[PDB]
Design a protein around this ligand. Structure first.
Ligand SMILES: [K+]
Ligand SMILES: [K+]
Ligand SMILES: [Mg+2]
Ligand SMILES: [Mg+2]
Ligand SMILES: [Mg+2]
Ligand SMILES: [Mg+2]
Length: 92
RNA sequence: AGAUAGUCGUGGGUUCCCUUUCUGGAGGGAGAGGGAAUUCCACGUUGACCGGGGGAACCGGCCAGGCCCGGAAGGGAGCAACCGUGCCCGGCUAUC
């Protein structure tokens, strides 16, 4: 799906950003104790009106295991966005 | 012509896992701190040097392929191979 997003205030989220067992392996923020399922996630994104649209047929290089990828709207910066999602994920 | 043994300190490098600031359409970019290693560099330090050889899938570094993101460039996690080490042989010197 190329780079359009750039023009849509979109940014790509590889699920690993959150649910990687090791940072070197991909996590960019504190580990999430609980375990989180895919659909649950999406859900949360939507919940923050990030209007997630998913992209199948896309393999993270640090684990070709994951074949999909989520497109989301930047809230302020990919960064802020993530914090926000993560922080939200740790919803007790 | 015997037995063994081959300096320690701080700084930094790197690597591993962790926490963290800013950031891009991916691979990612620019920083901060903590801990655990080090086979890697500083000088300073000590009698703690000199050569030789060698090869771990399961050690460390690195990584052809293959598996990936990229428009490409390139960037990645990573197996074999390679390297480095581990090891072995002398001398050299040290304590018995
Ligand atoms: K290897
Ligand atoms: K690499
Ligand atoms: Mg789109
Ligand atoms: Mg490595
Ligand atoms: Mg390759
Ligand atoms: Mg000897």
């Amino acid at each position: 799906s190329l780079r359009d997003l750039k023009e849509e205030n979109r940014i790509v989220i590889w699920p690993s950003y959150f649910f990687s067992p090791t940072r070197s392996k991909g996590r960019r923020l504190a580990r999430i104790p609980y375990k989180i399922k895919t659909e649950e996630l999406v859900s949360t994104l939507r919940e923050l009106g990030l209007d997630p649209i998913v992209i199948e047929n896309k393999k993270y290089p640090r684990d070709r295991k994951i074949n999909f990828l989520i497109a989301v709207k930047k809230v302020k910066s990919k960064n802020y966005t993530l914090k926000i999602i993560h922080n939200a994920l740790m919803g007790t």
